[PDB]
Amino acid sequence: MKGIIFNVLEDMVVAQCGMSVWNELLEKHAPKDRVYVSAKSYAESELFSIVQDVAQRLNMPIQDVVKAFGQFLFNGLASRHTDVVDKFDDFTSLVMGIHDVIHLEVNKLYHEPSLPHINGQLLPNNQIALRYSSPRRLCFCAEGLLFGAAQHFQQKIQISHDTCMHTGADHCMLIIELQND
């Protein structure tokens, strides 16, 4: 009933340094309200400030922290939306269903028509072309999410990101190759 994203995160930090670290940097970087709502979208920037700081104390690079954060975010989320996710029965069905159902249901349940831009297209040889674009330029997170869902189903995959809005590009290009080993 309070910030779904922050809820799954609190579980991650608690596993790294404990709840004291989460409450410490949270109270320092928290606003006047001092509350994280999942239905709202305000004070959402605090997540970024928390990801870079938590990385400092945890002694980790922000690029790795944001990634790991995603992998786990998917795990916890699935447990809350197992109904929506389970509609894929397999990593292949989800990647292409991301924007589609997964982001269409959360919109009605929370937030409002303004979710990142994701276009999954199926290719041959068991490959999937996933396009990503959004000012948040938090693509680094999208990668982690893809790996989190893959592992959850003992499914190994590889992602090639040559196009990144972070490199002046207007969008991004993430190709997820599926292993048939």
- Point out which residues bind ligand HEM (CB under 6 A): 41, 44, 74, 77, 81, 84-85, 98, 102-103, 106, 111, 115-116, 118, 134, 136, 138, 141-142, 145-146, 149
> For residues 26 and 118, which CB has a smaller minimum distance to ligand HEM in the complex?
118
Q: Maximum Cα–Cα distance for the chain, whole Å? A: 53
Whole-number minimum distance, CB 155 to ligand HEM, in Å? 12
Does 2 carry a binding-site annotation? yes
Instruction: Report d(CA 149, CA 178) in Å as an integer.
Output: 13
Q: Which helix (H) or strand (E) holds 156?
A: none
Q: Are 3 and 20 in contact (CB under 8 A)?
A: no
Does 172 carry a binding-site annotation? yes
Which are the contacts of 179, defined by CB distance < 8 A and separation ≥ 6?
A: 156, 157, 158
Taking each helix axis from N to C terminus, what angle separates 46-57 and 62-85, rounded to the nearest 10 degrees? 120
Whole-number minimum distance, CB 20 to ligand HEM, in Å? 26
Does 110 carry a binding-site annotation? no
Does 133 carry a binding-site annotation? no
Known binding-site positions for heme b: 2, 103, 114, 132, 134, 136
